[PDB]
From a paper:
Heterotrophic bacteria utilize GG phosphorylase (GGP), a member of the GH13_18 family, via a two-step process consisting of phosphorolysis and hydrolysis for GG catabolism. Like MaGGP, MsGGP falls in the GH13_18 subfamily. The crystal structure of MsGGP, akin to other proteins in the GH13_18 family, consists of four domains: A (residues 1–85, 165–290, and 347–429), B (residues 86–164), B' (residues 291–346), and C (residues 430–480). The proposed reaction mechanism for the GH13_18 family involves a double displacement reaction, forming a covalent enzyme–glucosyl intermediate.
The MsGGP–Pi crystal (C2 2 21 space group) contains three protomers (chains A, B, and C) in the asymmetric unit. High-quality density maps enable the precise modeling of MsGGP spanning residues 1 to 480, except for regions 311 to 338 and 378 to 391 in chain A, 315 to 336 and 378 to 394 in chain B, and 313 to 338 and 377 to 394 in chain C. All the three protomers in the asymmetric unit of MsGGP–Pi structure contain a phosphate molecule in the active site with a clear electron density. In chain A of the MsGGP–Pi structure, a distinct electron density corresponding to Tris is observed in the active site, occupying a position similar to that of the glucose molecule in a prior structure. Conversely, no such electron density is detected in the other two chains. Notably, the positions of the Pi ions differ significantly among the three chains. In chains B and C, the Pi ions are situated in close proximity to the glucose molecule within the active site, whereas in chain A, there is a slight deviation from the active center because of the presence of Tris occupying the active site. In chain B, Pi is stabilized by residues Asp49, Phe52, Asp190, and Phe154, forming direct hydrogen bonds with Asp49 and Asp190. In chain A of the crystal structure of MsGGP–Pi, the inactive compound Tris occupies the glucose-binding site within the enzyme's active site, whereas Pi is positioned at a site corresponding to the glycerol-binding site in the crystal structure of MsGGP–Glc–Gol. Conversely, in chains B and C of the crystal structure of MsGGP–Pi, Pi occupies the active site of the enzyme. These observations indicate that Pi likely follows a path leading to the enzyme's active center, serving as a ligand-binding pathway for substrates such as GG or other molecules.
Residue numbers in the entry:
A (entry chain A), B (entry chain A): 1 to 311, 339 to 377, 392 to 480
C (entry chain B): 1 to 314, 337 to 377, 395 to 480
Amino acid sequence: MLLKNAVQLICYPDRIGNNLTDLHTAVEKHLSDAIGGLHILPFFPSNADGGFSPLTHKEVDPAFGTWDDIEAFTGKYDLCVDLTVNHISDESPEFRDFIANGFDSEYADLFVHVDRFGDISPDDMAKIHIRKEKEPFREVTLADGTKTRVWCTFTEQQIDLNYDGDLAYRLMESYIGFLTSKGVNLLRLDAFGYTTKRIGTSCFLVEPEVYRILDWINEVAFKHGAECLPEVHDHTSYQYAISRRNMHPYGFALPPLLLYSLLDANSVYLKNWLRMCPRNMVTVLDTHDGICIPDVEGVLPDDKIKVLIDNCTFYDALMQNDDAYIAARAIQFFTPGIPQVYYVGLLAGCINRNYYTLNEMDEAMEKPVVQRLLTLMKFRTNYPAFDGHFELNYSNDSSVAMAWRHGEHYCHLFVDLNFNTSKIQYVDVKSGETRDLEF
Amino acid sequence: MLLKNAVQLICYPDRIGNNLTDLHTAVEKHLSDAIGGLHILPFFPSNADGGFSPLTHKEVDPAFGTWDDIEAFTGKYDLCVDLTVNHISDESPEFRDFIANGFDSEYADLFVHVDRFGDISPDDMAKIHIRKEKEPFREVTLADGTKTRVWCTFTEQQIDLNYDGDLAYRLMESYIGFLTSKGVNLLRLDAFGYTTKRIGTSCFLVEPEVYRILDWINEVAFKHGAECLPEVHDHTSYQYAISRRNMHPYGFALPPLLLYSLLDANSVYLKNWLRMCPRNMVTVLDTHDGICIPDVEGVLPDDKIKVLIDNCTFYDALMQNDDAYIAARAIQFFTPGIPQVYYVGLLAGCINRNYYTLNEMDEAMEKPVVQRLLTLMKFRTNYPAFDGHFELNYSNDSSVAMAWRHGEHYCHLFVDLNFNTSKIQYVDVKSGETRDLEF
Amino acid sequence: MLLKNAVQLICYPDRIGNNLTDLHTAVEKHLSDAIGGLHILPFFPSNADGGFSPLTHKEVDPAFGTWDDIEAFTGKYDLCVDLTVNHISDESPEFRDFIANGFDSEYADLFVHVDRFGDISPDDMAKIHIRKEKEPFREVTLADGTKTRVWCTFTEQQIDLNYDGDLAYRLMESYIGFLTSKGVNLLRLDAFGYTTKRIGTSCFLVEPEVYRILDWINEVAFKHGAECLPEVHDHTSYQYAISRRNMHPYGFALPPLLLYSLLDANSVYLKNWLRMCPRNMVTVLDTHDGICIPDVEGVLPDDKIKVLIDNIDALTCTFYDALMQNDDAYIAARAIQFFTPGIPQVYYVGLLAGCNYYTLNEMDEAMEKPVVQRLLTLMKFRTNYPAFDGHFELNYSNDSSVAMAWRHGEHYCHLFVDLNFNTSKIQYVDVKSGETRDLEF
């Protein structure tokens, strides 16, 4: 549908070269026919958390470039961008206005006021699903000298939005409209699970509230020509729930699943997942965040997870073994969904966030393992069979056999996990013969 | 779509009363507005395996009744019937003709000839997925006095069909056409996984062969006004694969999942499954076959399965506790899909295959627990909300909260697993008020 | 031809002093009555794997010395030397001729050509017992400019020999002849398990081919006055099969077994193993490889292996280090090793209490160490006291101690190890005076 069924690049704005212009130089020079889109990590004005505390989604942080540097991509490549639906910076225009004007501010109902709930019992606090070990409450000093408390799931420079009120949905629709006008196809919804706040609950993925919030955003997105990629790290059950509301789940189960598969030469759990895997997902191997274990619970039994845990750029977990890494990307790419490749993974780097100069990328492109990866990326991005249907094939319990078919076009992946071998056969339509991809 | 979204009765032809006429008497007397369909277990001429060795699918075994006794159901109730796609009786017209006329018989290519494969290595035999501990080869004496071997997965009176040849598909289309002409809506495909025979493979669910076989039958069924219910007992991954080819999977994960849930007062794994559960499934709690464990692998962790195993009509596994049983049916009925109720489960019986006289059923209907179950069955079969959408609600880890919505119509199930309590609230549209179902 | 029942030194040619002559000087100065033989690690022309890729077994690398420097040991000492039966260098004359002349070379059938089979199924690839994570196949560029593939289990400079053909047996009998002419008593058969290549199989320890190849090699050694020490790292069952074909297995079960015993003060599994242990084995404690787990499966239960593994990864671990550099524990392990039936080897680093190259002065220092003097006292006693030449009698003990004894007529010696306090006590019978006396170590 709306998006190109092609490889996407996950990248920062400023870590290949220095800015979006240098980024655009790198894509055109090397990746012009290997990717059909980019996920550019947060590139708005921000004041904490590596970019996830945006003052607004309506500005490019001038450090990275300008909206014209963004639109240079949005005529040839899909564009995936983060939408921080849970929270906005305390330095945002809206929150500074609440600080100035107190509860008389017209943006007051945009934030969550801990005082509405009343006294929250210990039992209700114990239900809250949060990683930090402080109460998720920031007490702020207003202009008048009063002290009120707002909900704060993350760092204190991040103020959560109020989805029992109305302003939060207007603010998001404004962001989505403007972002989509700039050429953004795909909205990665960051920390969507925390948008549901209800005392007595987990305040995380509270059902079915979470899906009504999620349905509303998707419709706003669809009116403006964009699809959604709701990102949550929890039981895969939420990935199928996302998938079944016409949104893109993450294939967060795949990376740890392949690590186990390759390290222990076992395809039983991988094949079972491919037979089940939620569809219309965006697949990753290495992210901008790293290793997440709860995403593979149930997909991989607890004993095999322990094996995996007992035995981080994705390349390092395979012990910098090129054959293993190439086979994992091969498997990822034939997995149903849109494959993302993180930029450090493209350059076979060695904590998960490195800087490259434009010379350093050209050098890294010369690496044998990287040329093998370009060959896959071009093939996955261009060969028409991937636009057809997935048919998994019978294999023994130490190998994986994956195929795609779209009319005449047919290609077949075979990975022997015992020897990390990658073999792709595809149909050259023009000659009608069966050919071996050289990678 | 084609089927009624209502409770179905799984029953034999001759175990409530003596035959299909007595069966029809029982449904009308007690179940006329509580079920929308029936799954009548094999009722064809058969010579082994409790009815799953049919001489033909074109005859009612006169012991049970006639096709007019069948059609008495197919004007008011959906009709689900077994189609033994893997094999037919050795006493069938087709196989006796092969015995008589040897390989000159025009039905010879309807069966699998072990000699085509050649010598089958030990390694290839070790791949075969079979329960019996004999080689799946029957050596038969022909009329001429020659001895040839045919493939035989089950008892020797069951001869497997050949889906590398052509006659097998004609025979099935003939069966489906005639069965559908008699009013059959739904074809339970028995032992479909064994139809794929290929040396070097498991000869069970061989992918993607199994789905092409499965797609073909579904299309034949759709031309003749019927849908399919492919029954396989293996990893749930096959249930999602079935579901994604416009066919009905079984919810074989649910029964052991509820047993664990109720016995250990834990909803975490149940809720995760409901959030994921394959859609358009047919749910059971007790079957005509009994306990199957591999259907809950992954759905329930290995440690909790051991708990379940360490701690059979479904009523007995709950220790004949009515509240627990009623709550399990309540949970089953709000689970997405078409709910089947096995007849012994309807009558709260106490190995999974009992006979009842027409008096004995009337008495069993008077049991308090059975009246509670009728109330659910009528509600699930008639209340319009189930025709809308499933929305699971937040609950603690010892309770389950399930709801359906279809316009104004809304009903909400809450089960406390600690006390086996069942509470249903629904919207009475006529008065517009919220009411409690009394059960 | 029967070997001396005495301690043997495992050592490099060039890491004590500068060369084999300095080695010989060091041996005579300190070890002349403490060892009855030497296992000199590979000293042939080689270009990979630390010496186990020999161009030929018929040359000494001129840096290390000469063949005459080797024969200087034979005459007072048994000599154990590696025979790489599985593979030879790609820079060897035989394979280099294969490079030039293709399949017209008369050395072509000496190597395994992966294309004989045709297509090898995934199921057959998955059967192969191979430790590296590439296919055991090297594709070589021929002189003609064409590309053919030969079987290659280890690094690509190591080309496996073809034991379905005949040339490999001649090549191997040739090496055995030359080695024995220089005085080699004992042939360590390196990577003996991969000699059996057969698609549809593990291509490692393939039975019963593997024993026929092993029996044949044993016979060639016997013609030329040599015995075999077939080295394989797998389930102990293979060690008893070797033992029962009149060859010397390694006691690879012992090191991990003693590590557990000392670390957990438990003699049950050690005693059970000594009661069963295969006969005519050569025992080591630290190898040139380290600690291997499949060598102790069954000998030590899976719960006790995990206990050991948990301790040691907190295996590239010199056995002295695995005992936390505890001198008493190390001496108690060497004592137990020495009373274990078989011929005990001491790796030279273990002799010198290292944690390496040494000069001749440095070895003099290492010999002065109290722990090394205790080890010398053991070695001399094991190499010279006649009771070991009789029969082994294991004694009853509690489950935290080990009681091991040997008897040969009047000669009798008795080891008692308390695993709780790492005490090593040996009492022996002084035949001439008839009294029982304590070895001072």
